[PDB]
Amino acid sequence: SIKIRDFGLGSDLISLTNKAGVTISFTNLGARIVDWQKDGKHLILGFDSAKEYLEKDAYPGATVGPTAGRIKDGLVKISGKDYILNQNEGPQTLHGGEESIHTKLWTYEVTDLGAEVQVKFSLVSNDGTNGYPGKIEMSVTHSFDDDNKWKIHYEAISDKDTVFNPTGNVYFNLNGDASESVENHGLRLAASRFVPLKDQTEIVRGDIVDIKNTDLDFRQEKQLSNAFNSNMEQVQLVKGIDHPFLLDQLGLDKEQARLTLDDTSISVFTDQPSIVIFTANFGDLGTLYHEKKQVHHGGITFECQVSPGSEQIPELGDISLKAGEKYQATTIYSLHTKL
Amino acid sequence: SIKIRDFGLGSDLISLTNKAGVTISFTNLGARIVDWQKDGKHLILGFDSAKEYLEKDAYPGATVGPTAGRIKDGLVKISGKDYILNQNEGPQTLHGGEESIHTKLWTYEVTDLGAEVQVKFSLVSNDGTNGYPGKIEMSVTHSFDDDNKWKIHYEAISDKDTVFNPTGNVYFNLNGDASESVENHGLRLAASRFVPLKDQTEIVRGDIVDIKNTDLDFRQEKQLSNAFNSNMEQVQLVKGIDHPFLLDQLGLDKEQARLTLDDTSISVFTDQPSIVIFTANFGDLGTLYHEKKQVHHGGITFECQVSPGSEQIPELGDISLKAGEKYQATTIYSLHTKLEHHHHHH
Numbered sequence: 072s073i074k075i076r077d078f079g080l081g082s083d084l085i086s087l088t089n090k091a092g093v094t095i096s097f098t099n100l101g102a103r104i105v106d107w108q109k110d111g112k113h114l115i116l117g118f119d120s121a122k123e124y125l126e127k128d129a130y131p132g133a134t135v136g137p138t139a140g141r142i143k144d145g146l147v148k149i150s151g152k153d154y155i156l157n158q159n160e161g162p163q164t165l166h167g168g169e170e171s172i173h174t175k176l177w178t179y180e181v182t183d184l185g186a187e188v189q190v191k192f193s194l195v196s197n198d199g200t201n202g203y204p205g206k207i208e209m210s211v212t213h214s215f216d217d218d219n220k221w222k223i224h225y226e227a228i229s230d231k232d233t234v235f236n237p238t239g240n241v242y243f244n245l246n247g248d249a250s251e252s253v254e255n256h257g258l259r260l261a262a263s264r265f266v267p268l269k270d271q272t273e274i275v276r277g278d279i280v281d282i283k284n285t286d287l288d289f290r291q292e293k294q295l296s297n298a299f300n301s302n303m304e305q306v307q308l309v310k311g312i313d314h315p316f317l318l319d320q321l322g323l324d325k326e327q328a329r330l331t332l333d334d335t336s337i338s339v340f341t342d343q344p345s346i347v348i349f350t351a352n353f354g355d356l357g358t359l360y361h362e363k364k365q366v367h368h369g370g371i372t373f374e375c376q377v378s379p380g381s382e383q384i385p386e387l388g389d390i391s392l393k394a395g396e397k398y399q400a401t402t403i404y405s406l407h408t409k410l
Numbered sequence: 411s412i413k414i415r416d417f418g419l420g421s422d423l424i425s426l427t428n429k430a431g432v433t434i435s436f437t438n439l440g441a442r443i444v445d446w447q448k449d450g451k452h453l454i455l456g457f458d459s460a461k462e463y464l465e466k467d468a469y470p471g472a473t474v475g476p477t478a479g480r481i482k483d484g485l486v487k488i489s490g491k492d493y494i495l496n497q498n499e500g501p502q503t504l505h506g507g508e509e510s511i512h513t514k515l516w517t518y519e520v521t522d523l524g525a526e527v528q529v530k531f532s533l534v535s536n537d538g539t540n541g542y543p544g545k546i547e548m549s550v551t552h553s554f555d556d557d558n559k560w561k562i563h564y565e566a567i568s569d570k571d572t573v574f575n576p577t578g579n580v581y582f583n584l585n586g587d588a589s590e591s592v593e594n595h596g597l598r599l600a601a602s603r604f605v606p607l608k609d610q611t612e613i614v615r616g617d618i619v620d621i622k623n624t625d626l627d628f629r630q631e632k633q634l635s636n637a638f639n640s641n642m643e644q645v646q647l648v649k650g651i652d653h654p655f656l657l658d659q660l661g662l663d664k665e666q667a668r669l670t671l672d673d674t675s676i677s678v679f680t681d682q683p684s685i686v687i688f689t690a691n692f693g694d695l696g697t698l699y700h701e702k703k704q705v706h707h708g709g710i711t712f713e714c715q716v717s718p719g720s721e722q723i724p725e726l727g728d729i730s731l732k733a734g735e736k737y738q739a740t741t742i743y744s745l746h747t748k749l750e751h752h753h754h755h756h
């Protein structure tokens with residue numbers, strides 16, 4: 072079933088219930104996922120109205136871009152030329168700059184295919200918006216099916232050479248309550264290397280490091296508390312995890328990561344080369360979700376994209392988008408329940 | 411009463427009915443007016459869904475900007491610096507460039523004051539959008555009261571020195587049918603001068619001309635047919651009117667324009683110095699409005715703003731906006747019945 076309702080400030084909340092009784096909901100404010108629940112438990116973090124996102128934290132569950140992550144000094148080179156993007160975190164451009172696409176109301180259309188329902192959100196980033204060349208016509212389609220698969224497919228076309236590497240910013244918490252750390256979840260992740268951060272500014276350090284046999288090696292399932300209790304300087308630096316992991320084998324058919332808590336597990340599939348993992352290292356901030364005060368480590372992301380820092384480490388990839396070329400990306404989060 | 415429902419594509423339709431039974435409606439797609447009816451008759455042009463605006467003509471009834479009108483070659487001078495804006499009509503920048511504010515979904519909040527209801531729409535134009543320095547935090551409040559006044563209040567603040575001069579693009583047609591020409595309406599307009607256009611590109615010619623006693627003189631009420639039938643160079647140039655008229659006396663207190671048909675009148679008040687009048691000179695295009703093919707001259711706008719061309723005719727004004735300075739503008743359209751005797755035949 073599909074239900075559309077007012078979510079506040081003119082935004083809509085679109086809720087989809089599949090044959091299994093699982094409910095997932097989105098909002099056009101930021102082409103974002105708001106909730107995902109089973110047997111009455113939330114599996115992700117989210118708010119109860121549009122105002123909350125705007126007042127508390129506008130990133131959770133949203134589509135972030137045009138470039139996801141931090142860009143050192145807000146600088147990118149396009150066709151050999153230097154362009155300075157909007158700087159909103161000190162001199163860095165984080166998540167596309169201030170007032171970016173996650174804070175805009177996108178238009179959308181719903182398509183019911185029966186076993187699957189799609190919600191296609193669209194937005195135009197005008198040429199020059201926050202320093203980025205354009206215009207870029209973007210669309211993000213979130214879909215949910217009867218097999219409990221939530222898929223995000225992105226597409227974009229630019230009138231001029233530009234940069235483009237968006238991501239989805241859902242935070243999972245299988246405890247179903249923000250006041251509870253995810254340290255009890257088990258994580259598996261098909262990555263043997265990671266990108267260390269330079270310092271507290273969180274820009275990349277410059278190198279690529281092998282994590283095999285370290286506290287960050289999750290090639291074999293392991294509980295998060297391990298990483299959390301590690302003394303690796305990278306863990307200590309951010310007080311948790313806030314880093315890009317390089318996937319060993321690329322392709323949409325491979326389960327790249329798996330998050331498990333008891334009988335409930337989430338599998339991640341993507342066609343992107345990296346997953347940025349951030350464990351809500353918010354200290355005592357205590358943001359409130361559903362009346363529950365969030366705890367440090369009260370959530371975890373799987374941001375699939377090209378690793379941030381390619382401006383300094385080209386080996387990471389190239390986020391250039393040439394005029395007239397069509398950008399495509401796909402990420403899937405699959406829900407499973409043991410029986 | 412206030413009612414809200416989906417209008418299509420994620421936009422909503424906000425419908426207000428005042429105590430006199432007059433209803434008016436808006437959409438957050440472009441902070442725009444959709445309809446205004448009295449006794450089951452449409453007083454303005456509009457479509458029945460959001461998609462129609464996007465597929466037929468996205469300007470009607472919209473808030474347009476950041477700069478309304480045409481800027482020659484897209485070039486503006488901001489604090490000694492030259493900036494080139496998005497050019498979407500040949501080398502011209504028309505109504506803020508392509509995919510401008512009229513095409514975005516604005517957020518909104520409704521405030522019920524009893525005798526008055528306000529719908530405040532908000533949007534942020536990011537710095538660099540379409541070449542404009544910003545960011546610019548904008549708000550447009552549309553309000554309707556028990557006295558039949560529809561008021562538009564604009565506010566804006568920029569982080570950077572920029573330019574700002576938006577307007578409202580409503581089109582009236584008191585026939586209530588787009589397929590009926592407005593040449594049968596009577597027009598009174600308190601303006602003695604106008605700004606001629608250079609040519610078909612529609613940029614300003616460079617001079618200001620006195621129109622007293624010509625077919626464009628509406629200081630004293632006359633039927634629109636007088637202008638439409640005129641062979642004056644400017645009218646032939648655009649096949650109707652599409653020009654800025656300079657108000658003779660400024661201030662929100664004065665009735666600057668009055669549009670009448672039979673027993674109904676619309677009066678125009680504004681704090682702006684000019685009114686751009688465009689009479690839907692679309693020829694045979696025939697866009698469908700409520701299944702009626704629109705006729706050439708099937709509509710008339712009263713875009714109140716600083717006249718276009720100040721880039722070339724400094725005397726027209728200055729639309730610059732300094733960083734941190736609060737922009738404000740107010741325009742009001744009021745509806746009356748039996749304000750005067752208007753009984754003609756066409």
Ligand SMILES: OC[C@H]1O[C@@H](O)[C@H](O)[C@@H](O)[C@H]1O
Nearest residue numbers: 130131140240313347349374
């Ligand atoms: O969503 C907010 C978070 O987003 C992550 O991508 C980022 O690395 C974190 O440091 C934090 O900013």
Ligand SMILES: OC[C@H]1O[C@@H](O)[C@H](O)[C@@H](O)[C@H]1O
Nearest residue numbers: 469479504652653686688713
């Ligand atoms: O279609 C909207 C109209 O807006 C008027 O301001 C302009 O002068 C007309 O030529 C036309 O562009």
Ligand code: NA
Nearest residue numbers: 081082083422
């Ligand atoms: Na809505």
